[PDB]
Amino acid sequence: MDRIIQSPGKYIQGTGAIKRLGDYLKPLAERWLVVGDKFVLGFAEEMLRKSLADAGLAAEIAPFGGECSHNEINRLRDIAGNAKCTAVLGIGGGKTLDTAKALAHFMNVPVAIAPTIASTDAPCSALSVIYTDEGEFDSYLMLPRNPNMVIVDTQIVAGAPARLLAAGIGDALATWFEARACSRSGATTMAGGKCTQAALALAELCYNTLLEEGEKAMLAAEQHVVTPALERVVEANTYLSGVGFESGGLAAAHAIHNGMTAIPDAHHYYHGEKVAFGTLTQLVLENAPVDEIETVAALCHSVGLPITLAQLDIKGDIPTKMRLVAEAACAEGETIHNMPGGVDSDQVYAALLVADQYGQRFLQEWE
Amino acid sequence: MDRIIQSPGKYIQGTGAIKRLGDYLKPLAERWLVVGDKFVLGFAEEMLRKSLADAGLAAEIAPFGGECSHNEINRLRDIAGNAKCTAVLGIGGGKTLDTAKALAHFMNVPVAIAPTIASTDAPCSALSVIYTDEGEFDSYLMLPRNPNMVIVDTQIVAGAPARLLAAGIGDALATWFEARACSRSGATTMAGGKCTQAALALAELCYNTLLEEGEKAMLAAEQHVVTPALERVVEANTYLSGVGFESGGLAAAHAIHNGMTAIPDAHHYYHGEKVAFGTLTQLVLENAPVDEIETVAALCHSVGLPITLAQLDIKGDIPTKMRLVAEAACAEGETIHNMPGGVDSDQVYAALLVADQYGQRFLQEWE
Amino acid sequence: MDRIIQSPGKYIQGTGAIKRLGDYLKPLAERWLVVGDKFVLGFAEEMLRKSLADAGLAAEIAPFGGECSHNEINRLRDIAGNAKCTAVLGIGGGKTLDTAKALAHFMNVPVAIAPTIASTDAPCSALSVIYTDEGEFDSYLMLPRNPNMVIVDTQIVAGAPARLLAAGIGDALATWFEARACSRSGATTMAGGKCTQAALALAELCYNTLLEEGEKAMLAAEQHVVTPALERVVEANTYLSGVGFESGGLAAAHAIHNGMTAIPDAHHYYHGEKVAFGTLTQLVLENAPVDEIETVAALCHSVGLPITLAQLDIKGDIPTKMRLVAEAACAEGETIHNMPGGVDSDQVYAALLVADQYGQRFLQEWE
Amino acid sequence: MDRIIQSPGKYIQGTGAIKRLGDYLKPLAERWLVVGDKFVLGFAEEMLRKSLADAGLAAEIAPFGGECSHNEINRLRDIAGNAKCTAVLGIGGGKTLDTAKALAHFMNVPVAIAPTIASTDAPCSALSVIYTDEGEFDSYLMLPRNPNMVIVDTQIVAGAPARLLAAGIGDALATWFEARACSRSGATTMAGGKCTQAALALAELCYNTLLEEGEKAMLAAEQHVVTPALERVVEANTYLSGVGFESGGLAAAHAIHNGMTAIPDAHHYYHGEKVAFGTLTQLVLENAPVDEIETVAALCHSVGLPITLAQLDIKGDIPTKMRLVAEAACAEGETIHNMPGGVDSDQVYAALLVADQYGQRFLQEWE
Ligand SMILES: NC(=O)c1ccc[n+]([C@@H]2O[C@H](COP(=O)([O-])OP(=O)(O)OC[C@H]3O[C@@H](n4cnc5c(N)ncnc54)[C@H](O)[C@@H]3O)[C@@H](O)[C@H]2O)c1
Ligand SMILES: NC(=O)c1ccc[n+]([C@@H]2O[C@H](COP(=O)([O-])OP(=O)(O)OC[C@H]3O[C@@H](n4cnc5c(N)ncnc54)[C@H](O)[C@@H]3O)[C@@H](O)[C@H]2O)c1
Ligand SMILES: NC(=O)c1ccc[n+]([C@@H]2O[C@H](COP(=O)([O-])OP(=O)(O)OC[C@H]3O[C@@H](n4cnc5c(N)ncnc54)[C@H](O)[C@@H]3O)[C@@H](O)[C@H]2O)c1
Ligand SMILES: NC(=O)c1ccc[n+]([C@@H]2O[C@H](COP(=O)([O-])OP(=O)(O)OC[C@H]3O[C@@H](n4cnc5c(N)ncnc54)[C@H](O)[C@@H]3O)[C@@H](O)[C@H]2O)c1
Ligand SMILES: [Zn+2]
Numbered sequence A, B, C, D: 001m002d003r004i005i006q007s008p009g010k011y012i013q014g015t016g017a018i019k020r021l022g023d024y025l026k027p028l029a030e031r032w033l034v035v036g037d038k039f040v041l042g043f044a045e046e047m048l049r050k051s052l053a054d055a056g057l058a059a060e061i062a063p064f065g066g067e068c069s070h071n072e073i074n075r076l077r078d079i080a081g082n083a084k085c086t087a088v089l090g091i092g093g094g095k096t097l098d099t100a101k102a103l104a105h106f107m108n109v110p111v112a113i114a115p116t117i118a119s120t121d122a123p124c125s126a127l128s129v130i131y132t133d134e135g136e137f138d139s140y141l142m143l144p145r146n147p148n149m150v151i152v153d154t155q156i157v158a159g160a161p162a163r164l165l166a167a168g169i170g171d172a173l174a175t176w177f178e179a180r181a182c183s184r185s186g187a188t189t190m191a192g193g194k195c196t197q198a199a200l201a202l203a204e205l206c207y208n209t210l211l212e213e214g215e216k217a218m219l220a221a222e223q224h225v226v227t228p229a230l231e232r233v234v235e236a237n238t239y240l241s242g243v244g245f246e247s248g249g250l251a252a253a254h255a256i257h258n259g260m261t262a263i264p265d266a267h268h269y270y271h272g273e274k275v276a277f278g279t280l281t282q283l284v285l286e287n288a289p290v291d292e293i294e295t296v297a298a299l300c301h302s303v304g305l306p307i308t309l310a311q312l313d314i315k316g317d318i319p320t321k322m323r324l325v326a327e328a329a330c331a332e333g334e335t336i337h338n339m340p341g342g343v344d345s346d347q348v349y350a351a352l353l354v355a356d357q358y359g360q361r362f363l364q365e366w367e
């Protein structure tokens, strides 16, 4: 079958990039619905309003309700119609950005995406994760188009909590290993085809960037300043990981992330933190060489990502809990079946327990 | 300043991909203006009509006049309006594809691009080269958006004259060296920013793919059959070279290509064939190591690309002609000024003569 | 533009070299004004007087006032005229040597330079740093000529405080990284041209000599004895670093050194000690690979150079202080603008905080 | 004993550098005696006169008599006195430059040196080779000072006969091997001390530059154009080879060059061409590894340097002739005694015959 790569039309990144939003957006449309979470608008609404106004654009500011839900999408569509908006700008974290993408899809208008953290690879994908209003997962809304533009102000990202950059490292860490597994098995990607050389190269570049720049970038993040190492990790967490997962493929790491919703234990932990441990588990499952698992565990440990169940607050009755996680990870349609040679719940259960023991030993030897 | 990468929204490649055009295009629009050159429609119009009709799409076939000109764009716009077309599909070589992109820009509608040869990196770029009707260069039309979709049927490409695949190798050969020069000098790219890591990786992947797959792919091309080596070179000539040049940067090789319009000698040679010799000249100009120039010259020689002036039919009064080429290559606004340390016409003139002598010696030692 | 390398006419180094001063100086001139600081004359005046007298030279001893100031230069010129001196010998540390060079320039006579410590790369350069009498910086006096001869008695150097050899290592450490940055950006050097291959080779030789010989040389320095390792480090701190900085280029490390005069905190620390931390900061700024920063930090740590702000006694209100340092480091005309891609104060501020955190972590892991 | 490196005060190189002579010379002196050979003044006198006049300098043009002789030095001194010249500029090849240096020494004034070919390492040294008027060698005049400035217009050099650049490659080829031999034996250099690390690094850089750039530079030379490869070889033939031989040491290669004046056969061959074969002979004498001799022989062959006696037109009665050469090469005071372990005429004779056979075999295998 065909080989396919998808991408946002234009990806932009640099310090102060919010100040240039208006000039970047003007070739696309004149009247913008701005979905932003209240915290982000707290510090960014004035700059954003100025950027668009100076470029001659209309801006209808719509504070985000917090959840990417069908009710919230229709609420924002009503608001957008009153202002005759012809495009959507989402500014914030993953839930805000998914909502903007879905809203623009249903209005059939361009979308611009301004991540104010680099915490997941959501910004670039042709995908919105729909939840109920209460926050329970609902469905994956596959979009016919990636976002028109993605604009990352790296100074805003650097000012955010450093834990959220580490979380993005965890999400991006899975990219190479899941795309490599899909290329080994010949699996179809979310772009709908087999993998291109381009996507595999960006996926592998993602991993090497994290290895080379992750620790340097976290020093900058903890000081809330921008260095080229932080710039490179933001690119890896956003563009490389986004194109990497969507056009290179998903496999065990993300099925294992999804499987942990079968227990309540890890509720306080971010998407990318659970994906980091899912990645360690995939490496056990595919029996990666010792040096490769050690390198990944050490990278995770160096930026604060969990390498044990207890670091995700998964404690007590581990056998019952890991059976729940393993069974949900292997549910019909899950991406774990993209692993070479197929995988069942018994193998995932085994990998979960062993990956946990590996991390415990690692933490012990680190004293 | 910001770092920026641009891309077509979706790039698709595989054998028989023309048969799936209708299903690929349906999420974008329902009524398609199809710009195709008469030779391509000669063999492809029936398959293309079937693909779109089976998917429930309207197709208004508009045979292409041959030149990407303002008169031709307005002619096609009139034809499209009569059929109430809501999108444009260009199918053919570079001139057809540039026309489709420019037409869709002026109609403000999506564009799909179906290269039937892999002869240049035109398909993916947010750029149309406008000519007069007589064929004289007119202007560069910079587009606000890359094409929505690019669809390469590799069986159609493999059936085309093999010389046109080699020409695409020549255009793609420049990608790594021009992007690397721009990254060394800190030059602004056509995407409007400094280079991303992603773009440099795709540019370098482009070069390595040509080295590893070029000769294997030409065997397939000469037999008019599809192998994975030909598939990889098509990707390199189209997606990698396209994103590579636009988001990684242009430099001396393409300024030297442009400079050869100052003489009539190379009129029978394709865009990518002149770019191959421009690349050898850039390597002399930047004083690349001997092994690197030899590798490039050998790659060019192995797929039939020119490594001497005479192989471009540039013969007689070489000093006067190369002074004309060097001066036009250094004209104000040319990309040769993206080279590290700056470059003037005396240095380009020197590099032209020396690159020519290098190629002559290479051909001699090859007997 | 032209490529230019400058050098003192003759550089001499070895144990007991002061005893041979007279024979080395005789081909240059017969009547010598000897500028020496009182401490150095305390131990060296008798040997120096004997060397010159035995060779048939006149010596007018002029104890140095301590500061390289315009008033001091004119005072010494008056003294020299009374004795009809036809050349100048400076013997001591950097302030003495700069004064001798400037004095000889204004008398229009040859100058010989005898460093009695290897604490900076001042001895070889065509530059004097002029201060007011109170010690405030005044101006850079660019000289039309490097010193005629430089004579380093390595036994006198080895007898000096070991901290002053480590300081020279810190000044010399910057040489490779600043010259490499200038060669990457194409910056003009203080020799007035672009860099030669010769200057880049001496700059890189400087760095490798410090890596290979620094710790061995400090053992000798602490014992106040001469070994070949100490001999090689003296050459690196004097000739290699001198030609390296002047003909290879200055960049961020020295602008950052200059920037710390915007705060009073580091007043007790030597020129080369501040340059060592400026070098670590430049490595953060140019995002050097982790292994390279670690190697530099470990080299600094092994000879006692500072790798944190607190080791320069910069403590308390770090954000305000580092903003002052960053702004002065980026003042108009500073060498930080020789860095590839340009640099502003926000980037320098970020690099300062991150380099400080890197050094703190290094010291912590070293326990 | 002390380690000593000597250098011209300022070395300048680039295309069109003759046009900037006046501004480069003005800080040194106002009234210049210009010694130039008639051929060079034929093309350069007008530019040179303009450069000095525009900078406000006086120029007394004195066409050179052709030989560096005591009679010629006194003739030029008389001419200089009539014009009250306060400095000397030599412009031309080695004989002109040696004369300018010696003249400035006897007038006790600064000297500037403008090589118009890069054929030997004469320009930078504190040495003039004095001949009788008939052209017989007379003596080595050791100078107390290297030239104040050396200015190489690389466009003038590139315009000269290409054979003269190859000759300079031959002279420069000896630099690394003779300096390395002197460093192995601990020999005293012409700077009067043991070798510095700086001088050994420049000597080795010289050799590697010839290996990497020699063939690329000869392509440029044959086209009479300037490329960066030609620029690097000019630096290697002039600055690197000059400092390399004088401060790194001479050994067998140059003693063997000197020894060939004992026969008339090689009279039509340039200094550097005889030094190339002397270098091959030294490699036999020191029993260099096979790969090293092959590399040197191949480098020589690739730029047209002789690797056999017959290529120096030394033919007929080879045993008698090589005994004459070997005996003169080993004369008292010759530099061949700087070779490790000492050398006598029987060993040199053996090396001459064997080096000749090696070159003959090399030429044969090359067909
Ligand atoms: N569509 C995709 O491809 C994709 C991929 C991965 C994840 N997702 C979805 O993204 C959601 C999680 O995204 P998330 O991890 O970013 O959580 P999130 O969107 O809820 O935001 C995280 C928090 O960061 C806060 N914060 C503090 N300082 C901030 C600052 N400077 N900038 C922005 N926010 C700041 C925000 O207010 C927010 O509470 C999930 O619903 C996930 O399903 C989608
Ligand atoms: N916009 C950009 O970024 C960009 C980049 C490079 C070149 N260009 C422009 O592209 C133009 C040249 O493009 P080109 O080299 O492809 O020439 P072209 O578009 O004129 O087509 C080359 C020929 O291939 C013929 N042919 C034979 N078999 C074919 C087959 N199976 N499929 C398709 N064609 C077949 C075509 O009819 C055509 O005559 C130039 O105008 C150039 O300026 C634009
Ligand atoms: N012109 C240039 O290129 C250049 C380069 C770097 C620094 N500088 C200037 O050099 C000055 C600092 O030079 P410095 O760091 O050598 O300080 P310094 O010249 O003041 O001397 C340092 C101290 O070492 C003392 N001491 C103890 N034992 C000694 C011994 N055996 N020999 C010599 N001194 C001994 C000296 O008396 C002196 O107090 C600054 O003014 C700086 O601007 C100039
Ligand atoms: N002092 C030292 O350290 C040292 C080192 C090596 C050689 N030497 C001496 O240098 C002398 C040989 O020097 P040489 O080989 O350069 O020969 P040379 O000085 O006689 O000049 C070579 C010829 O090049 C001609 N020519 C043609 N085009 C020219 C152009 N553009 N520019 C300059 N010249 C051009 C010149 O007129 C000249 O006839 C010998 O006397 C040698 O002893 C001295
Ligand atoms: Zn994820």
Ligand SMILES: [Zn+2]
Pocket: B120, B121, B171, B254, B271, B275
């Ligand atoms: Zn092209």
Ligand SMILES: [Zn+2]
Pocket: C120, C121, C171, C254, C271, C275
């Ligand atoms: Zn310094």
Ligand SMILES: [Zn+2]
Pocket: D120, D121, D171, D254, D271, D275
């Ligand atoms: Zn020589």
